[PDB]
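quick one: sodium ion bound model?
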Amino acid sequence: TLFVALYDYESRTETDLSFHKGEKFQILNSSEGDWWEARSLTTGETGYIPSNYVAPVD
Ligand code: NA
Ligand code: NA
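yep, here:
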């Protein structure tokens, strides 16, 4: 399942990933907690994203 960003997000450190609304992600690990390691389909950049900022793609 790919996920899509609901809102813009400005990351705090190098651990979490900044992204824009509408960006899509491949999820790498979602079972450390509610922050998921993810890869942007736009940039291929990876980092943690807040799961409450994404939804599964149509
Ligand atoms: Na960051
Ligand atoms: Na969500």
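Residues 11, 13-14, 16-18, 47 surround sodium ion (ligand 1) (CB under 6 Å).
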